[PDB]
Write a protein that binds this ligand. Structure first.
Ligand SMILES: O=C(Nc1cccc(S(=O)(=O)Nc2ccccc2F)c1)c1cnccn1
Ligand SMILES: O=C(Nc1cccc(S(=O)(=O)Nc2ccccc2F)c1)c1cnccn1
Lengths: 543, 543
């Protein structure tokens, strides 16, 4: 019963004396290993596979037999395992290898079960659930509708809360809300196991998602509900609908802006050009891109008490037409108005269409790549920014690497190593003249696990914007003098347990200051709280 | 508890009413499938993988979650799945992917556990075990010593008793007797989990194997012990040591000779050249090759009551020196003496060295390829056999296909479709002049599962040679007039349940005639017994 329970199984780490006592001597090969030795063996077993999907499949096999060994392997090799266990491999697993997820916990909802959602949750037989990740498979980036196969996205994201913040793997629940699929291949595929129908309209979509939120608030009252990989037609509206009434957040929207804001303020500190002297080209004018700009302005206003209006005036927003201005003659989308230039004439607007002429005119010190249209930050454009600052801040954040505005290698080459670079994706180091440069990766893992652990301990009534901004600031402040002297914008990803403990600590203190915390057992002073949070974390060691 | 038990789990075959009643509605995607629909889906999931090892890995995943669906998929696609689930894929899985077997039942013995073998078996907590497959990883063919990783061979072979003869998958036990490894890579491999030592000498080897046989006879008294993939230094001696005292057999030795003898006697019937008119070149003079010849002579003597001495005189044995004769001047190995020619002069012996001149002199009607040295049956040699018979019998049985004496395609091409061919391996059909030919595969699956089911029902004291010869004859007689009219030498592999039920029936009747049967509940007449055996078989359907 211990060997066959993946939560308590130790495999070859059972000592000979333990195997004798548990009557399992003949169930294992005779070698006895420590957990670090098992992790080294698993890491070799993974790297025997060349393709990410086969590495993923091997890690699923480990997780199904020895959960402690799985999470110990991820924690020892995190940067390398992240592309396998989540984006982009998990989406390819969902799309073409959905059987990899069948044996996992997954809770499936659809219109056939209307009015039974609470019964289904009760039936799942979990105890004090802490984190629930839900998707409908619609995709934040709107590529590759997964329908019911989106359950693998929720499974993968749940796993990152365990690895990142020590959420006990028994207290995470992955959910698929199957409201149909517009995936034409799936709609015709004899082997598609989900609802074989186009996506439900908004009225029915919200009827079912409302029942889900109300059922989860009753049956899983201790949980944070995290929306993952919902399409843009719904993801912003879901948060407007639920943010005050339920304990919920959207990582794609709120996590991303908190992580990019933290890293960007550290790039300002390194750059020699202080926040009010920055001239920031925001290349891309989607709701998400404007959210990131507003999250930067909010964080600088918190950290430095500059008037937020003056920080807004540092942004130069570029949409598909050109520089967004109040004078260029069009009716602006609501989200573009607050960053529109008021200081540019109609005549100058007409001559500010191409990114090259916009950069020549604006004289920016920062280029924020949120454009999703490929390598817009040319050598000529990067060379112009070198005219305005000694340390250009260049953030090519569009995903995947082919949609990205510039490679970190080109950014460093064209500035002779002056560029301060953050990426959505990991890159190898670049060496110029014997000096080494490596971009800072703004991975969402820096924030969501600590928000989850914080909301799990404090049990806040809801997750107001204050808790995300506090997580953003906490992350910024974790970047040490040492980190900064080596050009890093974030604390190191390998230190994610300490990072999450600190983010969670600061989130709790903010919930306590707002009197929204329902858990009154927690310390209310930072040093004693941080020690308490660290002790509360599940660790991937045998105990 | 039903979803997580692979023996009772039905996955998507649970109806909506059943999901309601079992409180599992939210645990599955909403599509309800029949077992045949699930099998079609799994077969597509398998064929999405190009490499055998990745197909194997996918089938392991099915087996770990839904045992009924795994065995239903094998039974629906048997010929195609056999190369994946056993030779040669299972050996490659053992050698390089041994982690595929960690979660499976496996019972591990070694010298560290001397005197505790019975305790280890008791600890395994099985009920009335029927079949135990044991290996030491030494390899029958002596290539790729697997040591402790030989457990995967036992696991794969156990699975074939379930698929082939409906041994209940709860009543099969795979065993590794780890007596060391001569695999130099393993002996230096930090991740090898077995006994890190060269193979024990014979005295210690037999001390431990004796304890195993005695322990299994006490703790698993209802079981057949089947030796799999033991090296030639031990496999013949193990059977001499144990055959009378324990319920045991070796498939490599006894199964192979029973299957080849059955197919060869059907080739004689098709050929127009009756057993006493056959002139059989036995190319290869190993113990195994002489065993196959002796099994043919024994079966013909049983079926036709020709004097066995006259059947022996139909064989012309060829070793590495040439035609084995009493006059060629050397001291013959014991196994070669009984097939040595007494009718060839010393002078003719000296001129009978190359296979070509041996064939020209002997004027054979059959070529039996048991040589293991590549494509010895040349066009010139096949063309000479066409001079001696209208239907050359050509059996290239050396493994793998590169060691084989002739391709079936070349055999049929060079004889314009007259050749009667059996292979160890599967081959595609050959079309000559719009007429189609396909070799008969002498797969060991024809015999061992039915011997296992027979020995499981009758509970004989031991497995004397009479039970193997009866299985051989039963298999021969299952080839219908219809089968024979289409050139088949065996009943079709897809019909393996009916085949095994009939082999088991005949084996039981032989045990009853010898008064070695311990199970007195069984019918003693063939029709009523065969019905009883069919009912006793585990079937891969939901019940
Ligand atoms: O856990 C079992 N066995 C085991 C054997 C060797 C090694 C390990 S391990 O847990 O040390 N490593 C491991 C396990 C999985 C897949 C990849 C792995 F590397 C475990 C078991 C569980 N139930 C039943 C019978 N055995
Ligand atoms: O059995 C479970 N789920 C399941 C989902 C879809 C489909 C099937 S299936 O059993 O229909 N097919 C199948 C299962 C395995 C791997 C390849 C497969 F094709 C099963 C389960 C078991 N425990 C816990 C939660 N779920």
């Amino acid at each position: 019963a211990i060997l066959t329970d993946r939560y308590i199984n130790r495999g070859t780490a059972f000592t000979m004396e333990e195997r004798q006592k548990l009557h399992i001597l003949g169930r294992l090969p005779p070698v006895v290993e420590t957990l670090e030795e098992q992790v080294a063996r698993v890491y070799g077993q993974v790297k025997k596979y060349e393709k990410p999907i086969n590495r993923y499949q091997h890690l699923v096999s480990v997780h199904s037999t020895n959960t402690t060994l799985y999470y110990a392997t991820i924690l020892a090799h995190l940067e390398e395992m992240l592309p396998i266990i989540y984006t982009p491999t998990v989406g390819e697993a969902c799309m073409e290898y959905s059987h990899l997820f069948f044996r996992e916990r997954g809770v499936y909802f659809n219109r056939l079960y209307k009015g039974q959602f609470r019964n289904i949750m009760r039936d799942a037989g979990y105890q004090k659930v802490e984190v629930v990740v839900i998707t409908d498979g619609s995709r934040i980036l709107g590529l590759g509708d997964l329908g019911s196969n989106g359950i693998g996205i929720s499974i993968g994201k749940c796993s990152l809360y365990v690895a990142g913040a020590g959420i006990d793997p028994r207290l995470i629940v992955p959910v698929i809300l199957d409201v149909g699929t517009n995936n034409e291949r799936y709609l015709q595929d004899k082997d598609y196991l989900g609802m074989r129908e186009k996506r439900l309209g908004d009225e029915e979509f919200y009827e079912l998602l409302d029942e889900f939120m109300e059922a989860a608030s009753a049956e899983w009252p201790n949980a944070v509900i995290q929306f993952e990989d919902f399409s843009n037609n719904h993801c912003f509206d879901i948060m407007e609908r639920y943010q005050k009434k339920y304990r919920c957040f959207n990582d794609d929207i709120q996590g991303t802006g908190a992580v990019i804001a933290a890293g960007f303020l550290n790039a300002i500190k390194l750059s020699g050009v202080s926040p009010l002297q920055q001239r920031i080209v925001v290349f891309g004018a989607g709701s998400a891109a404007v959210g990131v700009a507003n999250n930067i302005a909010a964080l600088a206003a918190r950290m430095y008490k500059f008037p937020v209006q003056d920080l807004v005036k540092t942004f130069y927003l570029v949409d598909t037409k050109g520089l967004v201005t109040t004078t260029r003659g069009d009716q602006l989308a609501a989200h573009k108005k607050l960053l529109a230039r008021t200081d540019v004439s109609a005549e100058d607007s007409a001559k500010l269409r191409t990114l090259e002429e916009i950069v020549r005119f604006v004289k920016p010190t920062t280029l924020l790549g949120l454009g999703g249209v490929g390598p817009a930050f040319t050598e000529e454009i990067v060379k112009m920014v070198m005219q305005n600052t000694e340390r250009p801040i260049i953030f090519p954040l569009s995903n995947p690497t082919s949609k990205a505005e510039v490679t970190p290698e080109n950014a460093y080459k064209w500035t002779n190593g002056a560029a301060i670079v953050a990426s959505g994706s990991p890159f190898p180091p670049t060496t110029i003249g014997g000096k080494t440069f490596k971009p800072s990766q703004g991975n969402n893992l820096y924030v969501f696990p600590g928000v989850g652990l914080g909301c799990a301990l404090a049990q806040p009534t809801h997750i107001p914007e204050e808790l995300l901004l506090t997580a953003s600031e906490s992350l910024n402040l974790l970047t040490t003098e040492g980190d900064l002297r080596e050009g890093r914008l974030y604390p190191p990803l390998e230190d994610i347990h300490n990072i999450s403990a600190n983010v969670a600590t600061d989130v709790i203190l903010e919930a306590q200051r707002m009197k929204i915390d329902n858990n009154k057992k927690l310390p209310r002073t930072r040093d004693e709280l941080l020690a308490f949070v660290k002790k509360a974390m599940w660790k991937p060691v045998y105990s």
